[PDB]
Structure 1
Amino acid sequence: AQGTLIRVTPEQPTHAVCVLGTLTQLDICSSSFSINASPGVVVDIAHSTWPLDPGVEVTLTMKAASGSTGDQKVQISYYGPKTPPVKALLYLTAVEISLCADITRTGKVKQRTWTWGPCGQGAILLVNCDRDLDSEDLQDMSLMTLSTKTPKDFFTNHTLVLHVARSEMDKVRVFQATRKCSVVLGPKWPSHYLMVPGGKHNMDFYVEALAFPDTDFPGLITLTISLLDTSNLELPEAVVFQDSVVFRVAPWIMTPNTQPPQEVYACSLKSVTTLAMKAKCKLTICQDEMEIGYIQAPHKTLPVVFDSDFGYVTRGGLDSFGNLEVSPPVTVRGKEYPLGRILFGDSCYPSNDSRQMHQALQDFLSAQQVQAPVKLYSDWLSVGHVDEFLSFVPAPDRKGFRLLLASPRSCYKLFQEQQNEGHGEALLFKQQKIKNILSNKTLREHNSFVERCIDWNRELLKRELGLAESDIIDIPQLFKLKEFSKAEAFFPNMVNMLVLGKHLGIPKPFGPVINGRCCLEEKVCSLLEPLGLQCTFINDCGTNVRRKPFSFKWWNMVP
């Protein structure tokens, strides 16, 4: 354990407290000898032994909490040459003081650093999310309990103070449970005196975080209990024993397309309701600027919405949440990413004309540390969203997903195959013929340049997510460089789909019709249906989706 040094002097007896669980050592030389003590003081001693060397270690531990004070005694016998000399006397009071929380993330309150992992230790705190007391409101918060056993007469001479560092007080709030709840630690004040009675007592506190992690806040918060001696009245108080819990604020975590859908939201059409009904998920009608994630603690998980029983954050077009996706769980040269890995789009290098997501957003995602964001290249698109060039769908096999990427190649091939077979005369959507498209040398060279960009991202997503080609799947799709040599879809972007859990809501290309059936619509299906997916096409997109949070407990990650 850790703790104190008691000095013993034949002049006058000493008095002292020993907190259970600590290591009380004893300074004899500062004044052969022998040691004798009450039955409940175990006096183990190394090199008992008799000598008077200061390298003699003497440690006392008490077996139990005292009933009075001086209940336990310790007699040290000074002797040698040819003399009786002194017996030095020492009067110990034993107390039990446990500041204790849920340090094993298991919903149950039972080494003073927070460590990640399945065999780590640390309580977890939820930030408080609310737009605009008893148990009616504390189910959400984190329970922490002081427990004490001390002799009835004890707190006339000692008091307990609970505190936080001035540097964390704004990021936390502690409530005290009288058996009303009132604030006792917080952004206003860092300490508080406890009115604890002698004998066997224990009091409950309730903690809430007020700040997600961020560049200026790793997300650790420490609350400490100090036991002070106030026995001498003129002297100030002396601290006898500090002990603490370290809490970690739960990060905001995003949910991938591979997670079962729980609910869809849309604004003021009736094709997404048909979709929801086959998907097994609920539909409520009352905007794609806000992303629905979650926070999670052993005792509570709670959906939290990231705008710009629902929580709410507002930190702050590449600089929007449509430029924000998450990979599904993936493993990458060993390192495991159980909660997926956040993808968001920017440029390659930075320039007079480069756009980017706002730095304060990027930073906030990084600090959330458990979905190590990856930067993709999307600045080549007029709009800028990574969703314009990728998507994720559930598979029932290899890894249990497929990365769909947009593929101008896969469209050229498809239209070329059509011509061969004899349908060069078919109308896409001006309304241009499937051939005039193939001949168009300015289109070609555009989709060539787009091809380079998507391919650049293919290779990042191959690297950063550990993907193999067997994980990817090219969906046929054309683009056009209009505004500023930036790209836009040459026909409805199919890869911008609503992945409603195995039931896909894809934008209908009004692609060239063969056997009374659109070739793109059709090729898309020979790619997806074998996987178990159920493609459906819609005409154009003001939809968010709440998905089931991962079983995996974020704190069991090891970033």
Structure 2
Amino acid sequence: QGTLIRVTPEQPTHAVCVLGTLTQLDICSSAPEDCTSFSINASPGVVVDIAHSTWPLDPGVEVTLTMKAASGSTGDQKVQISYYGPKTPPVKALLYLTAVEISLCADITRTGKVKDQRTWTWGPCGQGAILLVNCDRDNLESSAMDCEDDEVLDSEDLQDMSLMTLSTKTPKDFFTNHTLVLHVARSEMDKVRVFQATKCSVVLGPKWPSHYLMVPGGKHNMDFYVEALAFPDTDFPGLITLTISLLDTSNLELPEAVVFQDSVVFRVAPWIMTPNTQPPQEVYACSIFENEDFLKSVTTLAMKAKCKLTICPEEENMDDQWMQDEMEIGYIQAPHKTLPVVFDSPRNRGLKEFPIKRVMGPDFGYVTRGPQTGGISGLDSFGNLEVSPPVTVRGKEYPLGRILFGDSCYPSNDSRQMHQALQDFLSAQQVQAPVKLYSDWLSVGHVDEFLSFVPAPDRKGFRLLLASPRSCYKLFQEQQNEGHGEALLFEGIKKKKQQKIKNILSNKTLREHNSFVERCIDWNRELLKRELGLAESDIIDIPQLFKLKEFSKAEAFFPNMVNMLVLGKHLGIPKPFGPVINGRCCLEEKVCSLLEPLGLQCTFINDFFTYHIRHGEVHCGTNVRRKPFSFKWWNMVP
């Protein structure tokens, strides 16, 4: 800020001046009469500026003091104002000043180093410290997030927290007559916790919003550790402001008087997803009855992609094989710390405990949203939550991509949507600027059922894959044209009725159902084209047929090959069991023919009696954790 010091010849004044503050002098308000003019002398530590060697006494003349260094003792710098007139012997008003340093410091340049306007600004030319939600369990002992209680129990825990340092320089007796208090608005106290480091004891938090600091005179440095307890959300834009106030306590009869305030503003780091184009690090599945052979194929694939593997046994599954749906593995990121965090869906089926019990842990965060009992729908399953690779759309850059999730085309009595709380949560993270797609036409309702993304060595570095009946018809028609109309879809499967290409192509109901699906998909195609700035050369159609079953909702006619596992270049694609022609399933060949030229290795995994007949595939039965973007979210300008 600044302060106006009001000087008089009545007697001397005493004031404090915090270094880095603009201090100002009111000279004319008590200049005695007889007087035209004034002069200023000051001790050598005080710099005096005058705009608008002695000056006339005009009320809009401006005088400012700054102080080069902290006072060694009270009143050790002096200012002397001398009023005089044509025939008037000079009179002196005296000002005794005490200078001090009060620097509340934090990582506002975002480099791991703590060294007027306290605002937070995005971009690489911007400013403001980052703060992480301390939502992992470093505490080996119990089952709660670190930040739910009032204590630092491990010292590891401090690595997650943000460092703020108060740095004072004062006369030795200064806190005789002054006290410093640290504080946070009541508005924000339930979202941050602040520990004083001496070991560590809480000083600010949900229970207390202010704390008198115990600070010795001289040069002193006090270290604070800060954790956030809430992600940005609909009712929290994600800034937390911490303030240091300096109080004058000189008069034992009067109340304390504020002399100086400074702040730092923190922005709580958002939860961020990883697209399939990000290198994989760890893979997840369930093990259930008659599953074994699916799991070896997956194991083989992980191994080729360097990935840690992780399975969930039937004692914990409770029959729930759909590892995709209960959770999503994202990250949070600060200059000093980056760590994965599981977004745990309120789906709450058999896998309900898996995210809490097995995933949340040392350097592994947890978050959840929406109602935990009831109020939910299939569209809340995280097979319906994906994210694009980075894209630029008509000049605006989405360096972390854009979250995608499925929705209906309009709300009705029969329509489903992802719960508002999740949608609200995802938008509040800002940096991935969610897009709504149309998936309610699918029986299960998930965007993973009609799309996937894969890395590609050229263009923008990926391909959007989309399921395409058009493409499967063209392929099958082609095969009929070269004589293979007799070929049998479902060849090699027992307790299932083979069907010939000729009878498939002639089936008019099937051709109708697929035309309706073609429309549902094409709608999303243009939608993705617009909202991700894609062109056709970014997109590849995967031959895929559907059918309409109950409520005229759409299921996969044969294994949904786009519902694949993407481990870098190693694809784990469902086994279509197509019509076999010249030794090979023509589906597999068509796919390979589209993906192998991009460096991709296609492994066809058999999921037929395990997952496909249960209305899901490989992607639906697995999950991946992947490398965080290198791009720092705070450099975006959402």
TM over 0.5: yes
Closer/same/farther in 2, CA of residues 48 and 468 from structure 1, 3 Å limit? farther
Shift of 1:140: 1.1
Shift of 1:37: 0.5
Take 1:273 and 1:423, find their aligned partners in 2: how far apart are those partners?
A: 36
Matched, 1:187 2:206: yes
Aligned equivalent of 1:366:
427
Closer/same/farther in 2, CA of residues 557 and 49 from structure 1, 3 Å limit? farther
Take 2:217 and 2:340, find their aligned partners in 1: how far apart are those partners?
A: 43
Shift of 1:130: 3.8
Normalization by structure 1: what TM-score? 0.98
Shift of 1:255: 0.4
SS in 2 for 1:418: helix
| RMSD (Å), alpha carbons | 1.1
Take 1:49 and 1:249, find their aligned partners in 2: how far apart are those partners?
A: 53
Take 1:415 and 1:336, find their aligned partners in 2: how far apart are those partners?
A: 41
8 Å CA contact retained: 1:72, 1:92: yes
Shifted more, 344-353 versus 540-549: the winner is: 540-549
Shifted more, 8-17 versus 427-436: the winner is: 427-436
Take 1:484 and 1:94, find their aligned partners in 2: how far apart are those partners?
A: 77
8 Å CA contact retained: 1:134, 1:181: no
- Residue 38 of structure 2 is aligned with which of 33, 41, 64? 33
| Cα shift readout 1:145-196 (whole Å, capped 9, x = no counterpart) | 0000001010000010000000000000000011x31110000010000000
* Overall identity of the aligned pairs, in %: 100
8 Å CA contact retained: 2:169, 2:219: yes
Take 2:3 and 2:397, find their aligned partners in 1: how far apart are those partners?
A: 43
8 Å CA contact retained: 1:72, 1:93: yes
Closer/same/farther in 2, CA of residues 135 and 68 from structure 1, 3 Å limit? same
| Cα shift readout 1:88-138 (whole Å, capped 9, x = no counterpart) | 00000000000010001111102300000101000000001146x563421
- Residue 273 of structure 2 is aligned with which of 224, 244, 254? 254
Shifted more, 103-112 versus 219-228: the winner is: 103-112
Shifted more, 418-427 versus 105-114: the winner is: 105-114
Take 1:216 and 1:46, find their aligned partners in 2: how far apart are those partners?
A: 48
Take 1:444 and 1:288, find their aligned partners in 2: how far apart are those partners?
A: 31
8 Å CA contact retained: 2:136, 2:341: no
Aligned equivalent of 2:190:
170
Task: List runs of 5+ in structure 1 lacking aligned partners.
Answer: none
Take 1:434 and 1:361, find their aligned partners in 2: how far apart are those partners?
A: 44
Take 2:456 and 2:448, find their aligned partners in 1: how far apart are those partners?
A: 19
SS in 2 for 1:288: helix
8 Å CA contact retained: 1:157, 1:231: yes
Closer/same/farther in 2, CA of residues 48 and 141 from structure 1, 3 Å limit? farther
Shift of 1:284: 2.1
| Cα shift readout 1:55-83 (whole Å, capped 9, x = no counterpart) | 10100000100000110000000111310
Shift of 1:555: 0.2
Shift of 1:468: 0.5
Normalization by structure 2: what TM-score? 0.86
SS in 1 for 2:16: strand
Aligned equivalent of 1:116:
122
| Cα shift readout 1:222-253 (whole Å, capped 9, x = no counterpart) | 00000000001100000000000000000000
Shifted more, 48-57 versus 192-201: the winner is: 48-57
8 Å CA contact retained: 1:476, 1:520: yes
Shift of 1:324: 0.3
Report matched runs for 1:304-453 at 5 Å.
Answer: 304-308=341-345, 309-315=363-369, 317-429=378-490, 430-453=497-520
Q: Which runs of 4+ in 1 moved over 3 A?
A: 133-136
Shifted more, 135-144 versus 449-458: the winner is: 135-144
8 Å CA contact retained: 1:325, 1:387: yes
8 Å CA contact retained: 1:143, 1:206: yes
Take 1:86 and 1:404, find their aligned partners in 2: how far apart are those partners?
A: 87
Take 2:154 and 2:212, find their aligned partners in 1: how far apart are those partners?
A: 21
SS in 2 for 1:58: strand
Shift of 1:48: 5.6
Task: List runs of 5+ in structure 2 lacking aligned partners.
Answer: 31-36, 138-152, 288-294, 313-323, 346-362, 370-376, 491-496, 608-619
Matched, 1:85 2:67: no
- Residue 270 of structure 1 is aligned with which of 296, 321, 336? 296
Shifted more, 47-56 versus 120-129: the winner is: 47-56
Take 1:299 and 1:66, find their aligned partners in 2: how far apart are those partners?
A: 35
Shift of 1:49: 4.8
- Residue 167 of structure 2 is aligned with which of 144, 147, 155? 147
| Cα shift readout 1:13-51 (whole Å, capped 9, x = no counterpart) | 000000000000100001011111000100011116511
- Residue 290 of structure 1 is aligned with which of 327, 346, 349? 327
Matched, 1:514 2:581: yes
Shift of 1:288: 3.1
What is the aligned length? Answer: 556
